[PDB]
Write a protein that binds this ligand. Structure first.
Ligand SMILES: Cc1nc(-c2ccc(S(=O)(=O)NCCC(C)C)cc2)cs1
Ligand SMILES: Cc1nc(-c2ccc(S(=O)(=O)NCCC(C)C)cc2)cs1
Lengths: 193, 193
């Protein structure tokens, strides 16, 4: 009953490691979760909607993980704070590469995939600006760029660059170097200047 | 003869201001340039190949423009040097928004659009790292991150963020704020930490 949903979801995740959404049919999703095509249609309107449910769970996992960090401050320097935060995304999306890759491709195609991405980006940017602002108020960060514009550009960098790394794109920062790379750019631009 | 090619190219550019490639047919390209469908096929294999020729000319215009700057150093501070360079891309792509937007969408679909992008990105990154390195050698920039990894991340930021701005995406930096925003992040991260 609820198993079947999870099974359809685990099946699409597995099949996306090997091939793109366009190359996975409803039939393959049904088969893999051990159910018929019309039983599939009872849980999902389309394969597309399977991607979106997967993407939704990744995005919320990153989100919840970032909330957790916010409710319990790590006893540490300013560099490590930023690093820990950026690491929520590196680990969460980086443990879900096929879904990341496919969810990103679907922004071109699906207005809901586009709007789910857009909603959380705005949320993660507003939080980065709140923290930059907090940092400015206590006198640790200088008042340079508008905090919101700086956070916008830093979030957008992290999106393209984390995602280029996970996909092994040319060019990209090697995955084992990407965290350090982002964290130097966040910390120099936030504290410098 | 050669007019016809330019006319087909100017027509696709115009039609892309209003609608996506998928919504422009070969027929519309033919009509707009004042020729038949089969006369179209004599200049181009597909609409797709029309996009790619347009994208090729934009990319080379940015490229040539960046070469020019390199052959005649502006008599100026380090911030303005970077600003002038980033401005080549802001102006070039930003004067060609529909082609930018469509060329970017086509990376998902066209291996040649993907490979043309990938080739110039590698070139623009190698040049940014050469200049960062040069800057380190003269003692103006500190040896922090590997120059090539830093340039990778800065180029990728500029791509997503310039392109998000030109498309009016949510979120995005306002277009009238994006240059200043990028330039503070390049200069703090290159000279800081
Ligand atoms: C200590 C703190 N870190 C953050 C924070 C850290 C990283 C990011 S992020 O890496 O820029 N995430 C948004 C884009 C993802 C799709 C890759 C966003 C916010 C906010 S407060
Ligand atoms: C003074 C100099 N500036 C550069 C330089 C400046 C900007 C950029 S760039 O803005 O990062 N361009 C590559 C991506 C485009 C599609 C947006 C790349 C290199 C190299 S040397």
């Amino acid at each position: 009953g609820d198993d079947r949903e999870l099974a359809i979801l685990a099946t699409a995740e597995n099949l996306l490691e090997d091939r793109p959404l366009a190359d996975i049919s409803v039939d393959d999703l049904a088969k893999g979760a051990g159910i018929s095509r019309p039983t599939f249609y009872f849980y999902f309107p389309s394969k597309e909607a399977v991607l979106l449910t997967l993407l939704d769970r990744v995005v919320n996992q990153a989100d919840m993980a970032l909330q957790t960090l916010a409710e319990n401050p790590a006893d540490t320097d300013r560099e490590n704070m930023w690093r820990t935060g950026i690491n929520v995304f590196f680990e969460t999306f980086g443990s879900h590469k096929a879904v990341t890759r496919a969810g990103q491709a679907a922004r071109a195609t699906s207005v809901e995939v586009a709007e789910l991405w857009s909603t959380f980006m705005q949320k993660w940017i507003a939080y980065t600006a709140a923290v930059i602002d907090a940092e400015r108020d206590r006198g640790a960060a200088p008042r340079t760029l508008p905090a919101h514009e700086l956070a916008t550009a830093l979030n957008l960098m992290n999106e393209r660059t984390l995602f280029a790394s996970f996909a092994g794109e040319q060019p990209s920062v090697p995955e084992a170097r990407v965290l350090d790379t982002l964290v130097h750019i966040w910390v120099t631009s936030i504290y410098g200047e």
